[PDB]
Amino acid sequence: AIAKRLDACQDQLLELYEENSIDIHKHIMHWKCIRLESVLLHKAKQMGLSHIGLQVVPPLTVSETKGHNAIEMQMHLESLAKTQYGVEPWTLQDTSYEMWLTPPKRCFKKQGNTVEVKFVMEYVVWTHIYLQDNDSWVKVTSSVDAKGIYYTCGQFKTYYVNFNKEAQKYGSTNHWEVCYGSTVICS
């Protein structure tokens, strides 16, 4: 049963991955399957197993976490999908959990251009950032300046990269240089 369900499940995941869909509804499914695989693998190591076929069963916590994150990504995507933004192209990467944890944290986004800061380090400037207020969504854009990278929602700016702060993790000075496509802004 379980060995079969997990099998059916991991199969659907594989097809999704190899499919490289641009429709957000498919990625909601990926996350839905990731949850099932984590539920099942949880049940699997619960029943005594430690190996299924040639696959190593992971720790009970490992699955708890992954299952937990999946439901988060699952719910946020479903909300977004109800909007005009949901009809846009959404890659498996645009919807990854790692991506979701890239500044600005907990916001979907795409078209991230690379900015370089010499104290060097690279940071991403998102062309499109979608903010979630309850179940409502807004689409804003980013900009770069001497203090850092930020997006704008009204008259207020929100920095998600603080060149200053970022300057402590490196040089002893308060001097840094920002290079953005042949353009250079300096302290």
- CB count within 10 Å of CB 1 equals 7
Handedness of CA 115, 118, 122, 125 (dihedral sign): negative
Task: Spell out the domain ranges in the chain.
Answer: 1-96, 97-187
Instruction: Tell whether omega for the bond before 58 is within 30 degrees of 0, i.e. cis.
Output: no
Q: Residues with Cβ < 8 Å from 58, sequence gap 6 or more?
A: 41, 45
Q: With beta carbons less than 8 A apart as the criterion, state whether 59 and 109 touch.
A: no
Q: What backbone torsions phi and psi does residue 47 show, to the nearest 5 degrees?
A: -75, 5
Q: Which residues pair with 156 in a beta bridge?
A: 153
Q: Please give the structure tokens belonging to residue 31.
A: 């996350």
Residue 46, token pair as written in the block: 């619960």
Instruction: Please count the other Cβ atoms lying within 10 Å of the Cβ belonging to residue 19.
Output: 12
Angle between helices 2-19 and 24-46 (to 10 degrees): 150
Both tokens assigned to 181: 């496509």
Same fold, 1-96 and 97-187: no
Topology of domain 97-187 in CATH is Regulatory Protein E2; Chain: A; Domain 2 (2.170.200)
* Tokens standing for residue 185: 């802004």
- 28 within 8 A of 81, measured Cβ to Cβ: yes
Give the architecture-level CATH label for domain 1-96.
Answer: Orthogonal Bundle (1.10)
Is residue 79 within 8 Å of 135, Cβ to Cβ? yes
Q: How far apart are CA 111 and CA 92, in angstroms?
A: 14
**What resolution in angstroms, rounded to 1 decimal?**
2.5
61 CB-near residues (< 8 Å, 6+ apart): none
To which residue do tokens 């190593």 refer? 56
The residues, any chain, with a CB within 8 Å of residue 136's CB and separated by 6 or more, are: none
Burial of 86 (0-12, 13-18, 19+ CB in 10 A): middle
Closest CA to 130 of 93, 70, 74, 77: 77
Q: Output the CA torsion sign for 156, 138, 125, 182.
A: negative
